[PDB]
């Protein structure tokens, strides 16, 4: 499912992401935009053999099992495939644990490279929330 901008912002807000660990809603929308173009089915393989999954490109080395990243952890306790569902619930709850891990949203390279320090609120502008 390819989310609309406002649609995803409302879904993320409903799942407790606005201001989660100090990160306003615009940060998550911005990250999803540049990680996955709002597409829940986005996957991208990394050079170490791990794969990024779903709306927030959650990585199989640490956070989910894809049966294909040897010596990996499954700290979100989910199959990576669940991260691709049109329902973002699994992606959101896993991201909550990623962003609590110490490094905040720097765990997402596109957030730090393209969202951090910009006007992220513009990403929820015009949305009814």
Swiss-Prot record:
UniProt entry keywords in alphabetical sequence: Allergen, Antimicrobial, Bacteriolytic enzyme, Disulfide bond, Glycosidase, Hydrolase, Secreted, Signal
Catalytic EC class: hydrolase
Keyword Cytoplasm in annotation: no
EC code(s) of this entry: 3.2.1.17
Organs and tissues of expression: In the egg white and polymorphonuclear leukocytes.
Catalytic activity: Hydrolysis of (1->4)-beta-linkages between N-acetylmuramic acid and N-acetyl-D-glucosamine residues in a peptidoglycan and between N-acetyl-D-glucosamine residues in chitodextrins
One GO molecular-function entry: lysozyme activity
InterPro entries per the UniProt record, alphabetical: Glyco_hydro_22 (IPR001916), Glyco_hydro_22_CS (IPR019799), Glyco_hydro_22_lys (IPR000974), Lysozyme-like_dom_sf (IPR023346)
Disulfide bonds: 6-127, 30-115, 64-80, 76-94
Domain of life: Eukaryota
Gene3D superfamilies: 1.10.530.10
Domain C-type lysozyme: 1-129
GO cellular component: cytoplasm; endoplasmic reticulum; extracellular space
Positions with a binding annotation for substrate: 101
UniProt-listed GO biological process terms: cell wall macromolecule catabolic process; defense response to bacterium; defense response to Gram-negative bacterium; defense response to Gram-positive bacterium; killing of cells of another organism
Locations listed in the record: Secreted
Active site: 35, 52
Function field: Lysozymes have primarily a bacteriolytic function; those in tissues and body fluids are associated with the monocyte-macrophage system and enhance the activity of immunoagents. Has bacteriolytic activity against M.luteus.
Family affiliation: Belongs to the glycosyl hydrolase 22 family.
Further facts: Lysozyme C is capable of both hydrolysis and transglycosylation; it also shows a slight esterase activity. It acts rapidly on both peptide-substituted and unsubstituted peptidoglycan, and slowly on chitin oligosaccharides.
Subunit details: Monomer.
Name recorded for this polypeptide: Lysozyme C
Source species of the chain: Gallus gallus
Gene this protein is translated from: LYZ
């Amino acid at each position: 499912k390819v989310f609309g901008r406002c649609e995803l912002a409302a879904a993320m807000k409903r799942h407790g992401l606005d201001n989660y660990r100090g990160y306003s809603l615009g940060n998550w929308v911005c990250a999803a935009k540049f990680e996955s173009n709002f597409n829940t089915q986005a996957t991208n393989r990394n050079t170490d053999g791990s794969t990024d999954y779903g709306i927030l490109q959650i990585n199989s080395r640490w956070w989910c099992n894809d049966g294909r990243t040897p010596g990996s952890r499954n700290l979100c306790n989910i199959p990576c495939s669940a991260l691709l569902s049109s329902d973002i619930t699994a992606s959101v709850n896993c991201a909550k644990k990623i962003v609590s891990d110490g490094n905040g949203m720097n765990a997402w390279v596109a957030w730090r490279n393209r969202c951090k320090g910009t006007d992220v609120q513009a990403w929820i502008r015009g949305c009814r929330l």
